[PDB]
Amino acid sequence: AIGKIQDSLSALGKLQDVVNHNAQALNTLVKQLSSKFGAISSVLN
Amino acid sequence: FNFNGLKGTGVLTESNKKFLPFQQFGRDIADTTDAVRDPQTLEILDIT
C-alpha cells in the first residue's frame, strides 16, 4: 500500500501556486515601470 | 556609456549572442537593453 504512493506521483499544485503567485507579482511590478500615467514620457532622464 | 544615442550604465563584456544582420541592440524579458553592437567594430557586447 505504501509502494503504490510513488505510482500516483511519478498533486503538488498547491505548492506550485505559491511560486506562481509571487512570480506573477514580481513580473507585474517590473512591467509597471513602462507606463506614462499621462506624462510626456516614462523615463526620468 | 552611450552608443550612438543609446544612453545607459553597466559593465560591457564579450557576448555569445548573434543578432540578425540588421539589428543594432537587443533587449531582455521585461524590455531592458542587455546587448549592443559597436558601430565601428561590429562586435556584440553584453551589459550587466
Side-chain angles (χ1 to χ4, degrees):
Chain A
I2 196 168
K4 291 180 180 179
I5 296 299
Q6 290 177 304
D7 288 344
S8 68
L9 298 176
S10 175
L12 278 65
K14 290 180 180 178
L15 295 175
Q16 186 63 51
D17 288 345
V18 172
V19 172
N20 287 357
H21 289 168
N22 287 277
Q24 291 177 2
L26 294 174
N27 287 335
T28 299
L29 182 61
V30 173
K31 290 179 180 178
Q32 293 178 333
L33 295 175
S34 297
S35 297
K36 294 180 180 179
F37 301 98
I40 65 172
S41 68
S42 60
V43 178
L44 272 58
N45 290 334
Chain B
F1 64 71
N2 185 303
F3 295 93
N4 197 32
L6 183 66
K7 182 178 179 180
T9 301
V11 177
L12 300 177
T13 65
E14 295 85 359
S15 182
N16 64 341
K17 295 181 180 179
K18 301 291 183 182
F19 289 3
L20 300 176
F22 64 90
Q23 297 179 304
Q24 185 64 51
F25 65 91
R27 296 181 180 181
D28 65 6
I29 295 170
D31 196 47
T32 300
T33 301
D34 63 337
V36 299
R37 183 178 67 188
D38 295 320
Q40 291 178 2
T41 62
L42 302 177
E43 63 182 299
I44 304 301
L45 298 172
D46 290 343
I47 301 172
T48 62

Coordinates of all heavy atoms in Angstrom, one line a residue:
Chain A
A1 N 0.8 -1.2 0.0 CA 0.0 0.0 0.0 C 0.8 1.3 0.0 O 0.5 2.2 -0.6 CB -0.9 0.0 1.2
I2 N 2.0 1.3 0.7 CA 2.9 2.4 0.7 C 3.6 2.5 -0.7 O 3.8 3.6 -1.2 CB 3.9 2.4 1.8 CG1 4.5 3.8 2.0 CG2 4.9 1.3 1.5 CD1 5.3 3.9 3.3
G3 N 4.0 1.3 -1.2 CA 4.6 1.3 -2.5 C 3.7 1.9 -3.6 O 4.3 2.5 -4.6
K4 N 2.4 1.8 -3.5 CA 1.6 2.5 -4.5 C 1.7 4.0 -4.5 O 1.3 4.6 -5.5 CB 0.1 2.1 -4.4 CG -0.1 0.6 -4.7 CD -1.6 0.2 -4.5 CE -1.9 -1.2 -4.8 NZ -3.3 -1.6 -4.6
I5 N 2.2 4.6 -3.5 CA 2.2 6.1 -3.4 C 3.1 6.6 -4.5 O 2.7 7.6 -5.1 CB 2.7 6.5 -2.0 CG1 1.7 6.1 -0.9 CG2 2.9 8.1 -2.0 CD1 0.3 6.6 -1.1
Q6 N 4.3 6.0 -4.8 CA 5.1 6.6 -5.8 C 4.4 6.5 -7.2 O 4.6 7.5 -8.0 CB 6.4 5.8 -5.9 CG 7.4 6.0 -4.7 CD 8.6 5.2 -4.8 OE1 8.5 3.9 -4.9 NE2 9.8 5.8 -4.7
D7 N 3.7 5.5 -7.5 CA 3.0 5.4 -8.7 C 2.0 6.6 -8.9 O 1.9 7.1 -10.1 CB 2.2 4.1 -8.9 CG 3.2 2.9 -9.1 OD1 4.3 3.1 -9.4 OD2 2.7 1.8 -8.9
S8 N 1.4 7.0 -7.9 CA 0.4 8.1 -8.0 C 1.2 9.4 -8.2 O 0.5 10.4 -8.6 CB -0.4 8.2 -6.8 OG 0.3 8.6 -5.7
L9 N 2.5 9.5 -8.0 CA 3.2 10.7 -8.1 C 4.0 10.7 -9.4 O 3.9 11.7 -10.2 CB 4.2 10.9 -7.0 CG 3.5 11.0 -5.6 CD1 4.5 11.1 -4.5 CD2 2.6 12.3 -5.6
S10 N 4.8 9.7 -9.7 CA 5.6 9.6 -10.9 C 4.8 9.1 -12.1 O 3.9 9.8 -12.6 CB 6.8 8.6 -10.7 OG 7.5 8.5 -11.9
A11 N -1.7 17.0 -7.8 CA -0.9 16.6 -6.6 C -0.3 17.8 -5.9 O -0.9 18.3 -5.0 CB 0.2 15.6 -7.1
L12 N 0.9 18.2 -6.4 CA 1.6 19.3 -5.8 C 1.3 20.7 -6.3 O 2.1 21.6 -6.4 CB 3.1 19.1 -5.9 CG 3.7 18.1 -4.9 CD1 3.1 16.7 -5.1 CD2 5.2 18.1 -5.0
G13 N 0.0 20.8 -6.9 CA -0.4 22.1 -7.4 C -0.5 23.2 -6.3 O -0.4 24.3 -6.6
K14 N -0.8 22.8 -5.1 CA -0.8 23.8 -4.0 C 0.6 24.4 -3.7 O 0.6 25.6 -3.3 CB -1.4 23.2 -2.7 CG -2.8 22.8 -2.8 CD -3.3 22.2 -1.4 CE -4.8 21.9 -1.5 NZ -5.2 21.2 -0.2
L15 N 1.6 23.7 -4.0 CA 3.0 24.2 -3.8 C 3.4 25.0 -5.0 O 4.1 26.0 -4.9 CB 3.9 23.1 -3.6 CG 3.7 22.3 -2.3 CD1 4.7 21.1 -2.3 CD2 3.9 23.2 -1.1
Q16 N 3.0 24.6 -6.2 CA 3.3 25.4 -7.4 C 2.6 26.8 -7.4 O 3.1 27.8 -7.9 CB 3.0 24.6 -8.7 CG 3.4 25.3 -10.0 CD 4.9 25.5 -10.0 OE1 5.7 24.5 -9.8 NE2 5.4 26.7 -10.3
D17 N 1.3 26.8 -7.0 CA 0.6 28.0 -6.9 C 1.2 29.1 -6.0 O 1.1 30.3 -6.3 CB -0.8 27.7 -6.3 CG -1.7 27.0 -7.3 OD1 -1.4 27.0 -8.5 OD2 -2.8 26.5 -6.9
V18 N 1.9 28.7 -4.9 CA 2.6 29.7 -4.1 C 3.7 30.3 -4.9 O 3.9 31.5 -4.9 CB 3.2 29.0 -2.9 CG1 4.1 30.0 -2.1 CG2 2.1 28.5 -2.0
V19 N 4.5 29.5 -5.6 CA 5.5 30.0 -6.5 C 5.0 30.9 -7.6 O 5.6 32.0 -7.9 CB 6.3 28.8 -7.1 CG1 7.3 29.3 -8.2 CG2 7.0 28.0 -6.1
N20 N 3.9 30.5 -8.2 CA 3.3 31.3 -9.3 C 2.8 32.6 -8.8 O 3.0 33.6 -9.5 CB 2.2 30.5 -10.0 CG 2.7 29.4 -10.8 OD1 3.9 29.2 -10.9 ND2 1.7 28.6 -11.3
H21 N 2.1 32.7 -7.7 CA 1.6 33.9 -7.2 C 2.7 35.0 -6.9 O 2.5 36.1 -7.3 CB 0.8 33.7 -5.9 CG -0.5 33.0 -6.2 ND1 -1.3 32.5 -5.2 CD2 -1.2 32.7 -7.3 CE1 -2.4 31.9 -5.7 NE2 -2.3 32.1 -7.0
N22 N 3.8 34.5 -6.4 CA 4.8 35.5 -6.2 C 5.5 35.9 -7.5 O 5.9 37.0 -7.7 CB 5.9 35.0 -5.1 CG 5.3 35.0 -3.7 OD1 5.4 36.0 -3.1 ND2 4.8 33.9 -3.3
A23 N 5.8 34.9 -8.4 CA 6.4 35.2 -9.6 C 5.5 36.2 -10.4 O 6.1 37.1 -11.1 CB 6.6 34.0 -10.4
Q24 N 4.2 36.1 -10.4 CA 3.3 37.0 -11.1 C 3.4 38.4 -10.5 O 3.3 39.4 -11.2 CB 1.9 36.4 -11.1 CG 1.7 35.2 -11.9 CD 0.3 34.7 -11.9 OE1 -0.5 35.2 -11.2 NE2 0.1 33.5 -12.6
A25 N 3.5 38.5 -9.1 CA 3.5 39.8 -8.6 C 4.9 40.5 -8.9 O 4.9 41.7 -9.0 CB 3.3 39.8 -7.1
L26 N 5.9 39.8 -9.0 CA 7.2 40.4 -9.3 C 7.3 40.7 -10.8 O 8.0 41.7 -11.2 CB 8.4 39.4 -8.9 CG 8.5 39.2 -7.4 CD1 9.6 38.1 -7.2 CD2 8.9 40.5 -6.8
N27 N 6.7 39.9 -11.7 CA 6.7 40.2 -13.1 C 5.8 41.4 -13.4 O 6.2 42.3 -14.2 CB 6.2 39.0 -13.9 CG 7.3 38.0 -14.0 OD1 8.5 38.2 -13.9 ND2 6.8 36.7 -14.2
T28 N 4.7 41.6 -12.7 CA 3.8 42.8 -12.8 C 4.5 44.0 -12.3 O 4.4 45.1 -12.9 CB 2.5 42.5 -12.1 OG1 1.8 41.4 -12.8 CG2 1.6 43.7 -12.2
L29 N 5.1 43.9 -11.1 CA 5.8 45.1 -10.5 C 6.8 45.7 -11.4 O 6.9 46.9 -11.5 CB 6.4 44.7 -9.2 CG 7.1 45.8 -8.4 CD1 6.0 46.9 -8.0 CD2 7.7 45.3 -7.1
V30 N 7.6 44.8 -12.1 CA 8.6 45.4 -13.0 C 7.9 45.9 -14.3 O 8.3 47.0 -14.7 CB 9.6 44.2 -13.4 CG1 10.5 44.7 -14.5 CG2 10.3 43.8 -12.2
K31 N 6.9 45.3 -14.8 CA 6.3 45.8 -16.0 C 5.6 47.1 -15.8 O 5.5 47.9 -16.8 CB 5.3 44.8 -16.5 CG 5.9 43.5 -17.1 CD 4.8 42.5 -17.6 CE 5.4 41.3 -18.2 NZ 4.4 40.3 -18.6
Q32 N 5.1 47.4 -14.6 CA 4.5 48.7 -14.3 C 5.5 49.9 -14.4 O 5.0 51.0 -14.2 CB 3.8 48.7 -13.0 CG 2.7 47.7 -12.9 CD 2.1 47.7 -11.5 OE1 2.7 47.9 -10.5 NE2 0.8 47.4 -11.4
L33 N 6.7 49.7 -14.7 CA 7.6 50.8 -14.9 C 7.6 51.3 -16.3 O 8.0 52.5 -16.5 CB 9.1 50.4 -14.5 CG 9.3 50.0 -13.1 CD1 10.8 49.5 -12.9 CD2 9.1 51.2 -12.2
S34 N 7.1 50.6 -17.2 CA 6.9 51.1 -18.6 C 5.5 51.6 -18.8 O 4.8 51.2 -19.7 CB 7.2 50.0 -19.6 OG 8.5 49.6 -19.5
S35 N 5.1 52.6 -18.0 CA 3.8 53.3 -18.1 C 4.0 54.8 -18.0 O 4.8 55.2 -17.1 CB 2.8 52.7 -17.1 OG 2.6 51.4 -17.2
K36 N 3.3 55.6 -18.8 CA 3.5 57.0 -18.7 C 2.5 57.7 -17.8 O 2.7 58.9 -17.4 CB 3.3 57.6 -20.1 CG 4.4 57.2 -21.1 CD 4.1 57.8 -22.5 CE 5.2 57.4 -23.5 NZ 5.0 58.0 -24.8
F37 N 1.4 57.1 -17.4 CA 0.5 57.6 -16.4 C 0.0 59.0 -16.8 O -0.4 59.8 -16.0 CB 1.1 57.7 -15.0 CG 1.5 56.3 -14.5 CD1 2.9 55.9 -14.6 CD2 0.6 55.4 -13.9 CE1 3.3 54.7 -14.1 CE2 1.0 54.2 -13.4 CZ 2.3 53.8 -13.5
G38 N 0.1 59.3 -18.1 CA -0.4 60.6 -18.6 C 0.7 61.7 -18.6 O 0.3 62.8 -18.6
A39 N 1.9 61.3 -18.5 CA 3.0 62.2 -18.5 C 3.6 62.3 -20.0 O 3.1 61.5 -20.8 CB 4.1 61.8 -17.5
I40 N 4.5 63.2 -20.2 CA 5.1 63.2 -21.6 C 5.9 62.0 -21.9 O 5.9 61.5 -23.0 CB 5.9 64.5 -21.8 CG1 7.2 64.4 -20.9 CG2 5.1 65.7 -21.5 CD1 8.2 65.5 -21.1
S41 N 6.6 61.4 -20.9 CA 7.4 60.3 -21.1 C 7.4 59.4 -19.9 O 6.7 59.7 -18.9 CB 8.8 60.6 -21.4 OG 9.5 61.2 -20.3
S42 N 8.1 58.3 -19.9 CA 8.1 57.3 -18.8 C 9.5 57.2 -18.3 O 9.8 56.3 -17.5 CB 7.6 56.0 -19.2 OG 8.4 55.5 -20.3
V43 N 10.5 58.0 -18.7 CA 11.9 58.0 -18.3 C 12.3 59.3 -17.7 O 12.2 60.3 -18.3 CB 12.8 57.6 -19.5 CG1 14.2 57.6 -19.0 CG2 12.4 56.3 -20.1
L44 N 12.7 59.3 -16.4 CA 13.0 60.5 -15.6 C 14.3 61.2 -16.1 O 14.5 62.3 -15.7 CB 13.2 60.1 -14.2 CG 11.9 60.1 -13.3 CD1 10.9 59.1 -13.9 CD2 12.3 59.7 -11.9
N45 N 15.1 60.6 -17.0 CA 16.2 61.3 -17.6 C 15.8 62.0 -18.9 O 16.2 63.1 -19.1 CB 17.4 60.4 -17.8 CG 18.0 60.0 -16.6 OD1 18.0 60.7 -15.5 ND2 18.7 58.8 -16.6
Chain B
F1 N 28.1 54.7 -20.4 CA 28.3 54.5 -21.9 C 27.1 55.2 -22.6 O 26.0 55.4 -22.1 CB 28.3 53.0 -22.2 CG 27.0 52.3 -21.8 CD1 25.9 52.5 -22.6 CD2 27.0 51.4 -20.8 CE1 24.7 51.8 -22.3 CE2 25.8 50.7 -20.5 CZ 24.7 50.9 -21.2
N2 N 27.5 55.4 -23.9 CA 26.5 55.9 -24.9 C 26.9 55.3 -26.2 O 28.0 55.4 -26.7 CB 26.5 57.4 -25.0 CG 25.4 58.0 -25.9 OD1 25.4 57.6 -27.1 ND2 24.5 58.8 -25.4
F3 N 25.9 54.6 -26.9 CA 26.1 54.0 -28.2 C 25.3 54.7 -29.2 O 24.1 54.3 -29.4 CB 25.9 52.5 -28.2 CG 26.8 51.7 -27.3 CD1 26.5 51.5 -26.0 CD2 28.0 51.3 -27.8 CE1 27.4 50.7 -25.2 CE2 28.9 50.6 -27.0 CZ 28.6 50.3 -25.7
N4 N 25.8 55.7 -29.9 CA 25.1 56.4 -31.0 C 23.7 56.8 -30.6 O 22.8 56.7 -31.4 CB 25.0 55.5 -32.2 CG 24.7 56.2 -33.5 OD1 25.1 57.4 -33.6 ND2 24.0 55.6 -34.4
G5 N 23.6 57.3 -29.4 CA 22.3 57.8 -28.8 C 21.9 57.0 -27.6 O 21.5 57.6 -26.6
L6 N 21.9 55.7 -27.7 CA 21.5 54.8 -26.6 C 22.3 55.1 -25.3 O 23.6 55.0 -25.3 CB 21.7 53.3 -27.0 CG 21.3 52.3 -25.9 CD1 19.8 52.4 -25.7 CD2 21.7 50.9 -26.3
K7 N 21.7 55.6 -24.3 CA 22.3 56.0 -23.1 C 22.1 55.0 -22.0 O 20.9 54.6 -21.8 CB 21.8 57.4 -22.6 CG 22.5 57.9 -21.4 CD 22.0 59.3 -21.0 CE 22.7 59.9 -19.8 NZ 22.2 61.2 -19.4
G8 N 23.1 54.6 -21.3 CA 23.0 53.6 -20.2 C 24.2 53.5 -19.3 O 25.2 54.1 -19.5
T9 N 24.0 52.6 -18.3 CA 25.1 52.3 -17.4 C 25.2 50.8 -17.2 O 24.3 50.0 -17.3 CB 24.8 52.9 -16.0 OG1 24.6 54.3 -16.1 CG2 25.9 52.6 -15.0
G10 N 26.5 50.3 -17.1 CA 26.7 48.9 -16.9 C 28.1 48.5 -17.3 O 28.9 49.3 -17.8
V11 N 28.4 47.2 -17.1 CA 29.6 46.6 -17.4 C 29.5 45.9 -18.8 O 28.5 45.2 -19.0 CB 30.0 45.5 -16.4 CG1 31.3 44.8 -16.8 CG2 30.2 46.2 -15.0
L12 N 30.4 46.2 -19.6 CA 30.4 45.7 -21.0 C 31.3 44.5 -21.1 O 32.5 44.5 -20.6 CB 30.9 46.7 -22.0 CG 30.1 48.0 -22.0 CD1 30.8 49.0 -23.0 CD2 28.7 47.7 -22.5
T13 N 30.8 43.4 -21.6 CA 31.6 42.2 -21.7 C 31.4 41.5 -23.1 O 30.3 41.7 -23.7 CB 31.4 41.2 -20.6 OG1 30.0 40.7 -20.6 CG2 31.6 41.9 -19.2
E14 N 32.3 40.7 -23.5 CA 32.2 39.9 -24.7 C 30.9 39.0 -24.7 O 30.8 38.3 -23.7 CB 33.4 39.0 -25.0 CG 34.7 39.9 -25.3 CD 35.4 40.3 -24.1 OE1 34.9 40.0 -23.0 OE2 36.4 40.9 -24.2
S15 N 30.1 39.0 -25.7 CA 28.9 38.2 -25.7 C 29.1 37.0 -26.5 O 30.1 36.7 -27.1 CB 27.7 39.1 -26.2 OG 26.5 38.3 -26.2
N16 N 28.0 36.2 -26.5 CA 27.9 35.0 -27.4 C 26.6 34.9 -28.1 O 26.2 33.9 -28.6 CB 28.2 33.7 -26.6 CG 27.1 33.5 -25.5 OD1 26.4 34.4 -25.2 ND2 27.0 32.3 -25.1
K17 N 25.9 36.0 -28.2 CA 24.6 36.1 -28.9 C 24.9 36.5 -30.4 O 26.0 37.0 -30.7 CB 23.7 37.2 -28.3 CG 23.2 36.8 -26.9 CD 22.2 37.8 -26.4 CE 21.7 37.4 -25.0 NZ 20.8 38.5 -24.4
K18 N 23.9 36.3 -31.2 CA 24.1 36.5 -32.7 C 22.8 37.3 -33.2 O 21.8 36.8 -33.3 CB 24.2 35.2 -33.5 CG 25.4 34.4 -33.1 CD 26.7 35.0 -33.5 CE 27.9 34.2 -33.2 NZ 29.2 34.8 -33.5
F19 N 23.1 38.6 -33.4 CA 22.0 39.5 -33.9 C 21.7 39.1 -35.4 O 22.4 38.4 -36.1 CB 22.4 40.9 -33.8 CG 22.4 41.5 -32.4 CD1 22.2 40.6 -31.4 CD2 22.7 42.8 -32.2 CE1 22.2 41.1 -30.1 CE2 22.8 43.3 -30.9 CZ 22.5 42.4 -29.8
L20 N 20.6 39.6 -35.9 CA 20.3 39.5 -37.3 C 21.0 40.6 -38.1 O 21.2 41.7 -37.5 CB 18.8 39.5 -37.6 CG 18.0 38.3 -37.0 CD1 16.5 38.5 -37.3 CD2 18.5 37.0 -37.5
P21 N 21.4 40.4 -39.3 CA 22.2 41.4 -40.0 C 21.5 42.7 -40.3 O 21.7 43.3 -41.4 CB 22.7 40.7 -41.3 CG 22.5 39.3 -40.9 CD 21.3 39.2 -40.1
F22 N 20.6 43.1 -39.4 CA 20.0 44.5 -39.5 C 19.7 45.0 -38.1 O 19.3 46.2 -38.0 CB 18.7 44.4 -40.3 CG 17.6 43.6 -39.7 CD1 16.7 44.1 -38.8 CD2 17.5 42.2 -39.9 CE1 15.7 43.4 -38.2 CE2 16.5 41.4 -39.4 CZ 15.6 42.0 -38.5
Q23 N 20.0 44.3 -37.0 CA 19.6 44.7 -35.7 C 20.8 45.2 -35.0 O 21.9 44.7 -35.1 CB 19.1 43.5 -34.9 CG 17.8 42.9 -35.5 CD 17.3 41.7 -34.8 OE1 18.0 40.7 -34.6 NE2 16.0 41.8 -34.3
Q24 N 20.6 46.3 -34.3 CA 21.7 47.0 -33.6 C 21.9 46.6 -32.1 O 23.0 46.3 -31.7 CB 21.4 48.6 -33.6 CG 22.5 49.4 -33.0 CD 23.8 49.3 -33.8 OE1 23.8 49.4 -35.0 NE2 24.9 49.0 -33.1
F25 N 20.8 46.5 -31.4 CA 20.9 46.2 -30.0 C 19.7 45.2 -29.6 O 18.7 45.1 -30.3 CB 20.8 47.4 -29.1 CG 19.5 48.1 -29.2 CD1 18.5 47.8 -28.3 CD2 19.3 49.1 -30.1 CE1 17.3 48.5 -28.3 CE2 18.1 49.8 -30.2 CZ 17.1 49.5 -29.3
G26 N 19.9 44.5 -28.5 CA 18.9 43.6 -28.0 C 18.3 44.0 -26.7 O 19.0 44.7 -25.9
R27 N 17.2 43.5 -26.4 CA 16.5 43.7 -25.1 C 16.2 42.3 -24.5 O 16.0 41.3 -25.2 CB 15.3 44.5 -25.2 CG 15.5 46.0 -25.7 CD 14.3 46.8 -25.7 NE 14.5 48.1 -26.2 CZ 13.6 49.1 -26.3 NH1 12.3 48.8 -26.0 NH2 13.9 50.3 -26.7
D28 N 16.1 42.3 -23.2 CA 15.7 41.1 -22.4 C 14.2 41.1 -22.2 O 13.5 41.9 -22.6 CB 16.5 41.0 -21.1 CG 16.1 42.1 -20.2 OD1 15.2 42.9 -20.5 OD2 16.7 42.2 -19.1
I29 N 13.8 40.0 -21.4 CA 12.4 40.0 -21.0 C 12.3 41.1 -20.0 O 13.2 41.4 -19.2 CB 12.1 38.6 -20.3 CG1 12.2 37.5 -21.3 CG2 10.7 38.6 -19.7 CD1 12.1 36.1 -20.7
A30 N 11.1 41.8 -20.0 CA 10.8 43.0 -19.3 C 11.3 44.2 -20.0 O 11.3 45.3 -19.4 CB 11.3 42.9 -17.8
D31 N 11.8 44.0 -21.2 CA 12.1 45.1 -22.1 C 13.2 46.0 -21.6 O 13.0 47.3 -21.6 CB 10.9 46.0 -22.4 CG 11.0 46.9 -23.6 OD1 11.4 46.4 -24.6 OD2 10.6 48.0 -23.4
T32 N 14.4 45.5 -21.3 CA 15.5 46.3 -20.9 C 16.7 45.9 -21.8 O 16.9 44.7 -22.0 CB 15.9 46.2 -19.4 OG1 14.8 46.6 -18.6 CG2 17.1 47.0 -19.1
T33 N 17.5 46.8 -22.3 CA 18.6 46.5 -23.2 C 19.6 45.7 -22.5 O 20.0 46.0 -21.4 CB 19.2 47.8 -23.7 OG1 18.2 48.6 -24.4 CG2 20.4 47.5 -24.7
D34 N 20.0 44.6 -23.1 CA 21.0 43.8 -22.5 C 22.2 43.4 -23.4 O 23.2 42.8 -22.9 CB 20.4 42.5 -22.0 CG 19.8 41.6 -23.1 OD1 19.5 42.2 -24.2 OD2 19.7 40.4 -22.9
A35 N 22.2 43.8 -24.6 CA 23.3 43.6 -25.5 C 23.3 44.7 -26.6 O 22.2 45.2 -26.9 CB 23.3 42.3 -26.2
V36 N 24.5 45.2 -27.0 CA 24.6 46.2 -28.0 C 25.7 45.7 -29.0 O 26.4 44.8 -28.7 CB 25.0 47.5 -27.4 CG1 23.9 48.0 -26.5 CG2 26.3 47.4 -26.7
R37 N 25.7 46.4 -30.1 CA 26.8 46.1 -31.2 C 27.5 47.4 -31.3 O 27.0 48.5 -31.4 CB 26.1 45.7 -32.5 CG 27.1 45.4 -33.6 CD 26.5 45.0 -34.8 NE 25.7 46.0 -35.4 CZ 24.9 45.9 -36.5 NH1 24.7 44.7 -37.0 NH2 24.2 46.9 -37.0
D38 N 28.9 47.3 -31.3 CA 29.7 48.5 -31.5 C 29.6 48.9 -33.0 O 29.9 48.1 -33.9 CB 31.2 48.2 -31.2 CG 31.3 47.9 -29.7 OD1 30.7 48.5 -28.8 OD2 32.1 47.0 -29.4
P39 N 29.2 50.1 -33.3 CA 29.0 50.5 -34.7 C 30.3 50.4 -35.5 O 30.2 50.0 -36.7 CB 28.6 52.0 -34.5 CG 27.9 52.1 -33.2 CD 28.7 51.2 -32.3
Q40 N 31.4 50.7 -34.9 CA 32.7 50.6 -35.6 C 33.3 49.2 -35.8 O 33.7 48.9 -36.9 CB 33.7 51.5 -34.9 CG 33.5 53.0 -34.9 CD 34.5 53.8 -34.1 OE1 35.4 53.2 -33.6 NE2 34.3 55.1 -34.1
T41 N 33.3 48.4 -34.8 CA 34.0 47.1 -34.8 C 33.0 46.0 -35.1 O 33.5 44.9 -35.4 CB 34.8 46.8 -33.5 OG1 33.8 46.8 -32.4 CG2 35.8 47.9 -33.3
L42 N 31.7 46.2 -35.0 CA 30.7 45.2 -35.2 C 30.8 44.0 -34.3 O 30.8 42.8 -34.8 CB 30.8 44.7 -36.7 CG 30.6 45.9 -37.8 CD1 30.8 45.3 -39.1 CD2 29.2 46.5 -37.6
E43 N 30.9 44.2 -33.0 CA 31.0 43.1 -32.1 C 29.9 43.3 -31.1 O 29.5 44.4 -30.7 CB 32.4 43.1 -31.4 CG 32.7 44.4 -30.6 CD 34.0 44.4 -29.9 OE1 34.3 43.5 -29.1 OE2 34.8 45.3 -30.2
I44 N 29.4 42.1 -30.6 CA 28.3 42.1 -29.7 C 28.8 42.1 -28.3 O 29.7 41.3 -27.9 CB 27.4 40.9 -29.9 CG1 26.9 40.8 -31.4 CG2 26.2 40.9 -29.0 CD1 26.1 42.1 -31.8
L45 N 28.3 43.0 -27.4 CA 28.8 43.1 -26.0 C 27.6 43.0 -25.1 O 26.6 43.7 -25.3 CB 29.5 44.4 -25.9 CG 30.8 44.6 -26.7 CD1 31.3 46.0 -26.5 CD2 31.8 43.6 -26.2
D46 N 27.7 42.2 -24.1 CA 26.6 42.2 -23.1 C 26.8 43.3 -22.1 O 27.9 43.8 -21.8 CB 26.6 40.9 -22.3 CG 26.2 39.7 -23.2 OD1 25.6 40.0 -24.2 OD2 26.4 38.6 -22.8
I47 N 25.7 43.7 -21.5 CA 25.6 44.8 -20.5 C 25.1 44.2 -19.2 O 23.9 43.8 -19.1 CB 24.7 45.9 -20.9 CG1 25.2 46.5 -22.2 CG2 24.6 47.0 -19.8 CD1 24.2 47.5 -22.9
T48 N 25.9 44.1 -18.2 CA 25.5 43.6 -16.9 C 25.3 44.7 -16.0 O 26.0 45.7 -16.1 CB 26.4 42.5 -16.4 OG1 27.7 43.1 -16.1 CG2 26.5 41.3 -17.4

